[PDB]
Write a protein that binds this ligand. Structure first.
Ligand code: MG
Ligand code: MG
Ligand code: MG
Lengths: 134, 269, 110, 93, 249, 85, 87
């Protein structure tokens, strides 16, 4: 029956709104000097004119990922490739062949737009793709 | 140049895609094969039995765990706009920006700030964590930021990390408990920037870090963001601007505060 | 009541005066401002693209399908599309139309 | 012997009956409906098998847990026996 | 009177351009080319992933399947408790052994058996994009300003589809169930192969079942908004049914 | 098939039908009440929580009464809650 | 054909019949009422004053707090005693 008395305060609700998360990934803020302290750089504008295009991830990172299977098969994967993937395969082969001293073994997945490379070249490929403007 | 547009161009010639011409990707299906106690060695003492018992995992479920947040990760989150340095950074903002994942049911007690990436850390932030290393604190202070270590209990940590699920329960905001006796020394020590530590000692501790690591302690009082930098929550406050005992009504966008004397005394105690 | 018009034949043969007929239509939609390099006029403007393609479909009776609309970037692209003949004959008619040797007999049971 | 000497009545399936014509509709109720409802809520069937899958042992354990108290005596006895039988079978006893 | 010109409301990647479709009308037989609409390339010009279509089609087929087939084991068949006497008694343990006529089934169906599983949310969303892209690429997608009809007679809609060479089966998608025009509702309710669904009901199975897909302009904006949201969203903290700062809208 | 109600609830359903339903409301409540008898043959835990000696952690503790058998003879007399164990 | 209306979550608070024996008990108590108010607010019909603890519940809350949650001064004093003994 008897219940504690209370007051309805709308003014303080603004603090509650601070606590609500966003579903949408925010767009990176504009910086005066690139790259940022963490090393991030936005994609070039306008897009580089090439036969292929490498889209950024939803987090605005370059989609180059290390992959391993069987505990020993180190591989590098380039995802979100659009356009002529075969043109990217030749460009990657010319770029990596000096470092290895041989033509790199690769697999082109035209359906998924994925280039798979044997060995770890994620760091080198990320910088290489950043220069192109992707 | 055309790879996506070429595939769609080929589609125009081919027959209409339908339920009659679909197939799984080659390699996604292994063909089924049709025919058409463990740890027992057969009599001897098993290997896993003949090894002596040792307390490797004794009390594992009661050990405290802290998710590591590095300065590299923190700087990366700030660079991409997922954590805003212009406001106090706490567990809620870190979780909301997907910077860290906290599992209270797995004995997580918060985030521990780690020194990895201190050399390149440039952001000026006001950040509340549960544990911080000496080097991590120095990196934040050297940039004019403020770092404080605060304790959240399992119930409080669950609420702070996921506020909206709590508000939907319909319970009044509880007051977070004090740290256990063992932790009390850590959180009452200025060297750790403890939230329960004496504010007067802080200047001395802050200067000692500047001397040891060879940087000039900046004067945040002169900073434009000083008011935000010194913003801190009461030891009993889970959320900024929200007191214990308040009930959040998200449907009507209202907050209900109790006026009963006994209730007010309990929540403020 | 509404009477459905008879089914239209899909056969298409490019008119010999197509380039002249297009040049006129382009001058109407886009004006006479840029006669030089009329075939290079871009169709990025949706309103201009609609008027040109709509006029050609009404007159010629052959319309760019949805799949090819994005490919009509320039006026030259529109000219190339209308230079492609379309045939509406059935496969039986196609086989019979092609000269068959005296010893080949094709019967259609449909 | 063993094979029918006449053809069975021809099978006539109505591919465009209402059930087939509308199959799959609302399977994206969540993705396209602000996630107010989950697709598994569409599933009709036993109360203990809605939006859940498992092997026979797991199904029997789940059925007894959810509706065991409402089962008929003989059915419940068979279910209890089955679980015990399956428990030994699936655990390689 | 005036060409209906629809532009892509959401941002398009700078390296791509929107694809286009003709805007038509059902108010008259020859009311084609009433407008020109722009379609987001990431929804209507995605890579044609036939394998993903198979993934989503099979998921729709089986995820809600419940098999009610069940047999009786030797422990459930009536009787059979005793060891048959005929000359020891053990030679046969029970008359309901699977080897015996009328015995239990050794390895029969033990239902009800569920086939429930869920594809990742992003995969199911991608399937819808592929289906929409496949329809447009094969000239099976027609965009309407509205589904309003001159009359409710089904023979009109049938003749209209025939005149425009749509195909034997047409899927009609309107924005909302409540605001569906009565004229199209009456016509499609008497037609077996002309099916009318709301936008929320769009699914890969129905799209493949029907040769032709008809979407209204509002439905296009609705589809692009829902499907593109998956591309840029965060990982979920909790179910999207619960409140978020920016969701819904 | 399944029953509409759990078999353990059939008893309570009987009180909603026929002569049992017409019984006084105050009397019916006495039947519905399930008060816990005073501990006689076991020693109850003092508090809801206790500190586990083995691991030094606060853990919830519950009182589990011992089943007591009351022979028909006890109904004639007054045993003060005691019974056969 | 025309598809049947899309399945929609039933609107508003659901108050299960308390008398019905098939009504789950978890839907009866106060923990369920509090969730109906948080989700639907005023439209729930729950009296907001019930959300907070009552004098009886509050007394038990404070009793539990003092028993297992000592004050800061008590913990600091206890630590000093242990530090002296160990030293
Ligand atoms: Mg891997
Ligand atoms: Mg038997
Ligand atoms: Mg049988």
């Amino acid at each position: 029956p008897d219940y504690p008395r209370f007051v309805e305060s709308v003014d303080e609700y603004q603090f509650v709104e601070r606590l609500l998360p966003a579903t949408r990934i925010p767009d990176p803020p504009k910086h005066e000097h690139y790259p940022t302290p963490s090393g991030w750089q936005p994609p070039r504008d306008p897009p580089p004119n090439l036969p292929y295009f490498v889209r950024r991830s939803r987090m605005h990172n370059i989609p180059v990922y290390k992959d391993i299977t069987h505990g020993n098969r180190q591989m590098t994967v380039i995802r979100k490739v659009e356009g002529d993937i075969w043109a990217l395969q030749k460009d990657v082969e010319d770029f990596l062949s000096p470092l290895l001293g041989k033509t790199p073994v690769t697999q082109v997945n035209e359906v998924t737009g994925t280039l798979r490379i044997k060995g770890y070249f994620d760091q080198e490929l990320k910088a290489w793709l950043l220069e192109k403007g992707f | 140049q055309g790879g996506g547009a070429r595939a769609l161009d080929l589609l125009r010639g081919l027959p209409r895609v339908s339920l009659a011409n679909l197939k799984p990707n080659p390699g996604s299906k292994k063909p089924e094969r049709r025919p058409r106690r463990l740890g027992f060695e057969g009599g001897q003492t098993p290997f896993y039995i003949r090894i002596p018992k040792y307390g490797f995992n004794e009390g594992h479920s009661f050990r405290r765990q802290y998710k590591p947040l590095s300065l590299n990760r923190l700087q990366y989150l700030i660079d991409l706009g997922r954590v805003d340095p212009s406001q106090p950074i706490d567990l809620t903002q870190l979780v909301n920006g997907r910077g860290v994942t906290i599992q209270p049911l797995k004995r997580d007690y918060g985030v521990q700030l780690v020194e990895e990436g201190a050399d390149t850390f440039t952001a000026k932030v006001n950040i509340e964590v549960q544990l911080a290393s000496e080097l991590a604190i120095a990196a934040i202070e050297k940039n004019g930021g403020v770092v404080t270590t605060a304790f959240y209990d399992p119930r409080s940590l669950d609420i702070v990390c996921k506020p909206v699920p709590f508000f939907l329960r319909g319970q009044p905001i509880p007051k977070r408990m004090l740290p256990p006796e063992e932790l009390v020394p850590y959180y009452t020590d200025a060297k750790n920037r403890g939230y329960l530590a004496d504010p007067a000692k802080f200047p001395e501790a802050r200067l000692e870090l500047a001397r040891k690591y060879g940087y000039i302690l900046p004067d945040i009082t002169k900073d434009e963001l000083f008011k935000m930098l010194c913003t801190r929550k009461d030891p009993r406050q889970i959320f900024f601007g929200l007191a214990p005992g308040w009930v959040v009504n998200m449907a009507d966008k209202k907050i209900l505060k109790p006026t009963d004397e006994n209730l007010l005394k309990y929540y403020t105690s | 009541i509404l009477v459905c018009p008879p089914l239209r034949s899909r056969a298409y043969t490019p008119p010999e005066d197509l380039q002249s007929r297009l040049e006129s239509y382009v001058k109407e939609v886009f004006g006479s401002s840029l006669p030089s390099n009329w075939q290079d006029i871009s169709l990025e403007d949706s309103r201009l693209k609609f008027n040109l393609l709509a006029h050609l479909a009404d007159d010629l009776g052959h319309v760019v399908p949805n799949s090819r609309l994005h490919q009509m970037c320039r006026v030259r692209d529109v000219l190339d599309f209308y230079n492609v003949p379309i045939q509406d004959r059935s496969k039986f008619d196609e086989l019979s139309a092609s000269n068959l040797p005296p010893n080949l007999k094709i019967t259609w049971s449909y | 012997i063993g094979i029918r000497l006449t053809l069975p009545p021809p099978k006539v399936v109505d591919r465009w009956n209402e059930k087939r014509a509308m199959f799959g509709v609302y399977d994206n109720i969540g993705i396209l409906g602000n996630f107010e409802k989950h697709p598994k809520e569409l599933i009709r069937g036993p109360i203990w098998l809605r939006g859940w899958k498992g092997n026979e042992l797991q199904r029997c354990i789940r059925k007894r847990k959810m509706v065991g108290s409402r089962m008929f005596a003989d059915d419940l006895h068979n279910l209890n026996k089955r679980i015990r039988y399956l428990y030994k079978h699936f655990n390689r006893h | 009177p005036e060409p209906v010109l629809r532009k892509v409301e959401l941002p398009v990647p700078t390296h791509r351009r929107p694809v286009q479709a003709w805007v038509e009308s059902l108010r008259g037989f020859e009311q084609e080319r009433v407008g020109l609409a722009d379609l987001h390339p990431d929804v209507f010009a995605t890579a044609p992933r036939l394998d993903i279509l198979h993934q989503v089609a099979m998921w729709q087929k089986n995820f809600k399947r419940i098999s009610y087939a069940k047999t009786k084991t030797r422990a459930e068949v009536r009787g059979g408790g005793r060891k048959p006497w005929p000359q020891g008694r053990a030679r046969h343990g029970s008359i309901r052994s699977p080897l015996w006529r009328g015995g239990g089934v050794a390895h029969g169906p033990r239902g009800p058996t569920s086939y429930y599983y869920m594809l990742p949310m992003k995969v199911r969303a991608l399937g819808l994009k592929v289906a929409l892209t496949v329809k447009l690429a094969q000239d099976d997608l027609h965009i309407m300003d509205s589904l309003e009809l001159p009359t409710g007679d089904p023979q009109y809609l049938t003749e209209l589809a025939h005149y425009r060479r749509w195909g034997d089966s047409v899927l009609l998608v309107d924005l909302t169930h409540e605001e569906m025009p009565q004229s199209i509702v009456e016509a499609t309710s008497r037609l077996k192969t002309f099916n009318l669904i709301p936008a929320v009901g769009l699914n890969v199975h129905s799209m493949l079942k029907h040769q032709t897909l008809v979407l209204t302009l509002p439905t296009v904006a609705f589809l692009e908004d829902k499907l593109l949201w998956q591309d840029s969203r965060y990982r979920p903290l909790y179910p999207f049914s619960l409140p978020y700062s920016d969701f819904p809208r | 098939p399944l029953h509409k109600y759990p078999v353990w609830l059939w008893k309570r359903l009987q009180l909603r039908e026929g002569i049992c339903s017409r019984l006084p409301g105050h009397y019916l409540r006495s039947l519905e009440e399930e008060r816990t008898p005073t501990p006689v043959h076991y020693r109850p835990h003092g508090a809801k929580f206790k500190i586990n000696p083995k691991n030094g952690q606060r853990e919830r503790v519950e009182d589990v009464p011992i089943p007591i058998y009351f022979p028909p003879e006890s109904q004639r007399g007054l045993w003060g809650g005691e019974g056969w164990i | 054909y025309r598809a049947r209306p899309p399945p929609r979550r039933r609107p508003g608070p659901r108050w299960p019949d308390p008398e019905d024996l098939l009504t789950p008990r978890w839907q009866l108590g106060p923990r369920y009422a509090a969730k109906q108010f948080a989700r639907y607010g005023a439209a729930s019909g729950v009296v907001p004053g019930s959300l907070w603890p009552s004098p009886e519940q509050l007394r038990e809350l404070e009793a539990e707090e003092r028993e297992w949650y000592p004050s800061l001064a008590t913990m600091q004093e206890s630590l000093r005693v242990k530090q002296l003994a160990e030293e």
